[PDB]
Design a protein around this ligand. Sequence first.
Ligand SMILES: Cc1cccc(C)c1OCC(=O)N[C@@H](Cc1ccccc1)[C@@H](O)C[C@H](Cc1ccccc1)NC(=O)[C@H](C(C)C)N1CCCNC1=O
Lengths: 99, 99
Amino acid sequence: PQITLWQRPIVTIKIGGQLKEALLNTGADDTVLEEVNLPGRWKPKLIGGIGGFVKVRQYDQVPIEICGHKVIGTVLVGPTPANVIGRNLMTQIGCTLNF
Amino acid sequence: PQITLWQRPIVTIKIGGQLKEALLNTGADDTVLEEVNLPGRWKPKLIGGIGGFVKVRQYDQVPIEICGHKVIGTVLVGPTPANVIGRNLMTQIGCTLNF
Ligand SMILES: Cc1cccc(C)c1OCC(=O)N[C@@H](Cc1ccccc1)[C@@H](O)C[C@H](Cc1ccccc1)NC(=O)[C@H](C(C)C)N1CCCNC1=O
C-alpha cells in the first residue's frame, strides 16, 4: 500500500478492539489518539508546549493494527483535535518516505 | 531516496537561491517557511488550526529544489518556529508513503 499525498493520509487503525480514523504524520513524532480507554498501567507525559504543554497518558507496548499491519507500540492517550500516527508507529509498520 | 523515520525527516531544500533545511510533513497541507524575501506578488492567507489564525504570505509557482528534485509550487512565507514541507510539494516531487 502506497499512498500518494494528494489527499490527507488518513487511515483506519484497529486499536482497543475498536476501529478509528488516523493521520500518518511524519511531522508528528509520537502518537495521540482521542480519548480511549486501554487496560493496565500508564504514566503521564506532556506533549505540545506551544502555549502550554498538554498533559496526556502514556501507555507502552500496545497492540494496534494499521492496514492489516498488526503492530505493537507506545501510544499516548487524552485530548486530541483528531487521532494522529506518528513516526513511532510508522517505523514499526515499516512506513517510509519515497520519491 | 527512501527515508525511514527513526528520525525527523529533515531534508535540505534550495528555495530562493538560498539553502534551507526543512521537515518532511505529511501532516501538513501546505508548505510554510520562516520569512525569506521573494519576488513576485502575493496574496494574504491564514493558517494555524487554534487560538487564532496566522497571517502570512502566499506565493505561487515558486522554484524550490528538494533533495535535488527541482519543482514548482505555492509556498507560504511568515512566522513558524520551523520550515515545513507539506503535501503540496510532496505530490509535486512525487513522494509517497510506503509500507
Ligand atoms: C495533539 C493533536 C491532535 C490532533 C491534531 C493536531 C494538529 C495536534 O497537534 C498540534 C501540533 O503542533 N501538531 C504537529 C505535530 C505534533 C503533534 C504531537 C507531538 C509532536 C508533533 C503538526 O501537525 C502541526 C504543528 C502546528 C504548528 C505549531 C506551532 C508553530 C507552527 C506550527 N507543527 C508543528 O508543531 C511542527 C513541529 C512538530 C516540527 N512545527 C513546529 C515549528 C515551526 N513549524 C512546524 O511545522
